[PDB]
Design a protein around this ligand. Structure first.
Ligand SMILES: [Ca+2]
Ligand SMILES: [Ca+2]
Ligand SMILES: [Mn+2]
Ligand SMILES: [Mn+2]
Lengths: 239, 239
């Protein structure tokens, strides 16, 4: 069995096990700010940032046909400072081709480049979407499972507890092909769940990079914070 | 669309929407004690109790072939007073034939009668097992998905936070056939998940009763509390 795992109780500036991209920044206090926070302490619009675990994950083996099961956990906070314009756009956990570069920002969360379902993306993602784009359900924010597209194969609305820390748990069981996500707000006790069938073997390449990405809006002040406090990951590939 | 739903933010003695069976009683304080609490304030062994919702639920329709999606949530607490003998046995949420009475207690949790996988049980359930019987995984407590058998088709160990309140969320999406269960301990922030594929049409009858059940051990002082503070349920049958 081939296994890989990491756990950051807090983010460490300078730890090479994590690559920062775009506006992404790790504060001295240990917080990962995916989208730029201005001098005045407020989230900047037109911003996109990501972080990738430096080491690639062996998610499945073509020769043997085996597929790994995995789980990732992280705590994050989103603070929407203005009543208008609407806030945007969200953050997301993603898995895809190794050594990828940030894609289009805004509603594409830095992971996609358009709103088409393309197998060439070879990406699987769990989003926490804050702005309703033409391809989105009307309810916002919402959790969404993305398979080779920003257009979720399934979504689940949830209420944002402004500035409060949300605990997220994502798990994929290769035998049942079930990918599930759970979001918990310890502040209010609220619990949300979403799940769907996903055959990673039909989506992702054998080796992938796992990461987090966030993006703020296209017009002035259509922004919000996309801070992450901790991130753990584990994958087990049977032989 | 055929929909049904109920929500007890608390329990009240006398409310006839809930049928109490065996040792289960609703205290003046509004707490549902599935298993007998003696006069000295401790849990009695050799006790089995359950509560059923008075009205049946239309889970699926043979003629049209339509299948209902549902979700249920509840809060419970288990207190294990002694170091020895081991505590036992657990509580569980179940869906099965209407007009049912409590089955065997102990490790069968008042829902099954043996350790066989019999289609005649026509029962689906999510247990929170505190004792490890011969058919169980070695770790207890554990969550488990039961399909016509006390021998779970899938289990998930978890740590008990003694006497603390656990928040449970169980959801079933018929289109994906996914059955998910989540447990959250507000006290510690701990989150546990478990999911599996279940085709209710191959398991349950068209109409079912939904309920909760708890049981204590077969030997003196092999017991624990099985209190439920709240319970909600909702189902929706397409067309
Ligand atoms: Ca969006
Ligand atoms: Ca047991
Ligand atoms: Mn979306
Ligand atoms: Mn068990």
């Amino acid at each position: 069995v081939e296994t890989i795992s990491f756990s950051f109780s807090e983010f460490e500036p300078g730890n090479n096990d994590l690559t920062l991209q775009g506006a992404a920044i790790i504060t001295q206090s240990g917080v990962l700010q995916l989208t730029k926070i201005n001098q005045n302490g407020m989230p900047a619009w037109d911003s996109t940032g990501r972080t990738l675990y430096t080491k690639p994950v062996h998610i499945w083996d073509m020769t043997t046909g085996t597929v790994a099961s995995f789980e990732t956990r992280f705590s994050f906070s989103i603070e929407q400072p203005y009543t208008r314009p609407l806030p945007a756009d969200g953050l997301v956990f993603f898995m895809g081709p190794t050594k990828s570069k940030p894609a289009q920002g805004y509603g594409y969360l830095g992971v996609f480049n358009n709103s088409k379902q393309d197998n060439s993306y070879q990406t699987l993602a769990v989003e926490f979407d804050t702005f309703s784009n033409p391809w989105d359900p009307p309810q916002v924010p919402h959790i969404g499972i993305d398979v080779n597209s920003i257009r979720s194969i399934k979504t689940q609305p949830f209420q944002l507890d402004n500035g409060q820390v949300a605990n997220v748990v994502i798990k994929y069981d290769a035998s049942s092909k079930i990918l599930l996500a759970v979001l918990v707000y310890p502040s209010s006790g609220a619990i949300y769940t979403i799940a769907e069938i996903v055959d990673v073997k039909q989506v992702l390449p054998e080796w992938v990079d796992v990461g987090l990405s966030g993006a703020t809006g296209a017009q002035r002040d259509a922004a919000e914070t996309h801070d992450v406090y901790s991130w753990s990951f584990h994958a087990s590939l049977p032989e």
